[PDB]
Design a protein around this ligand. Structure first.
Ligand SMILES: Nc1ncnc2c1ncn2[C@@H]1O[C@H](CSCC[C@H](N)C(=O)O)[C@@H](O)[C@H]1O
Ligand SMILES: N[C@@H](CC(=O)O)C(=O)O
Ligand SMILES: [Ca+2]
Ligand code: NA
Ligand code: NA
Length: 374
């Protein structure tokens, strides 16, 4: 109950000072829907300069910067209404106080706006040097980009599987009054609870459920609209990843297979699913799309694949190895890169990675697979 009141007061503050408009102005309309990695350790100094020089350092924006970049604000310099909120946020662990109590600064949550929603995310993904516990990324944004929002009815039943911060569920909640959001991690489940309240939603229009993906998929509930950005990264045998990163199956795509295979049953006829994954492939395209011809022929589906980023597998060796080394606390003499290269070649057959959003529709009047590449 005190946390809920604190989040209500945070929403009041964000409304009072026009947070979403400020964020939107800073990042601009040609970046707002590209990626959440806009305000980061590398751009924070320029954000601070904007507040200082273009917004005049006004005290009403001091608490906002604590939330947005982690910048310290002197406690006595906060406006009276903001000061009590700051204290409540410190009590909730959503901001820090300095040891002498004379200032407030960032904790592990960063405030952004995405797709018209206000969102706390894990600050560690864009700042600092400790591994994050809640994922968000450009792939999250691109799977939402392709949803045709004008086709969503207020009565449509929607589900966001593997919800994380809640971003896709909260986006869907802009249009339909029936959204289910699922996860199994303690940390993302607590965060989507906060973000639901931060956007004036509650259990009356969006249910948050602790439930395994495959349990929701086997269930009897039927949906008109489904979104899922599942764990999809394949790591070599013997390496531990994280809950949000490591996909199941030999090639990391087991959860994608699980979802697609149940779509004819879990979607109402004519319903649509939107998935996103970084898919291994050869020069012609992602391997996974070949598995989907069985859903065109077997179920009369229309399947559209939007390839928005292409990288050679060699360009992912470092990022994968860095992530594995950081996540498990491994030392610097381990030849992780060779293990990743061998796995890409022998198991994944990955010459390239294709960041792909996939729309799948049942009972299609124009069934077929369509792959869009630039
Ligand atoms: N078996 C499973 N069932 C349900 N959720 C799972 C799961 N395995 C992992 N997860 C959750 O899957 C999420 C993948 S990250 C995607 C988060 C969010 N939908 C976004 O697009 O940004 C993580 O939050 C993780 O906790
Ligand atoms: N889109 C291609 C160019 C083309 O096929 O016209 C590359 O990039
Ligand atoms: Ca800018
Ligand atoms: Na700084
Ligand atoms: Na994912």
């Amino acid at each position: 109950p005190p946390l809920a009141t604190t989040i209500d007061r945070l929403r009041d503050y964000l409304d009072r000072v026009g947070f979403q408009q400020i964020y939107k102005y800073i990042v601009a309309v040609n970046h707002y829907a590209v990626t959440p990695a806009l305000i980061t350790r590398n751009t924070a100094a320029s954000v601070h300069h904007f507040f200082d020089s273009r917004l005049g350092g006004r005290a009403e924006f001091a608490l906002l910067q604590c939330l947005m970049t982690g910048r310290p604000a002197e406690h006595a310099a906060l406006p009276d209404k903001d000061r009590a909120l700051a204290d409540a946020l410190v009590t909730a662990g959503l901001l820090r106080a300095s040891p002498d109590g004379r200032e407030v600064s960032g904790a592990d949550r960063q405030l952004i706006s995405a797709f018209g929603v206000d969102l706390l995310i894990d600050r560690r993904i864009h700042f600092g040097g400790e591994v994050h516990e809640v994922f968000i990324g450009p792939d999250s944004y691109w799977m939402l980009y392709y949803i045709n929002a004008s086709g969503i009815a207020r009565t449509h039943r929607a589900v966001d599987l593997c919800t994380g911060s809640g971003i896709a569920a909260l986006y869907l909640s802009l249009f339909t009054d029936h959204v289910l959001a699922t996860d199994i991690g303690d940390v993302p489940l607590a965060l989507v609870e906060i973000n639901r309240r931060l956007n004036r939603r509650d259990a009356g229009t969006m249910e948050i459920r602790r439930e395994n993906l495959n349990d929701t998929l086997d269930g009897r509930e039927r949906f008109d609209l489904l979104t899922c950005n599942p764990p999809f990264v394949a790591f070599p045998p013997g390496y531990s990843g994280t809950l949000y990163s490591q996909g199941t199956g030999v090639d990391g795509l087991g959860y994608m297979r699980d979802i697609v295979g149940r779509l004819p049953e879990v979607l109402n006829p004519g319903g649509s699913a939107y998935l996103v994954a970084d898919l291994c492939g050869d020069a012609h395209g992602p391997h996974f799309l070949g598995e989907l011809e069985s859903m065109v022929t077997g179920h009369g589906m229309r399947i559209e694949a939007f390839i928005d980023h292409v990288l050679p597998a060699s360009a992912q060796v470092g990022p994968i190895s860095d992530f594995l080394r950081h996540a498990a606390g491994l030392p610097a003499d381990t030849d992780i890169a060779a293990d990743v290269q061998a796995f890409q070649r022998e198991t994944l057959r990955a010459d390239y990675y294709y960041l792909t959003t996939i729309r799948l529709q049942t009972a299609a009047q124009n069934p077929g697979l369509r792959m869009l590449r630039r």
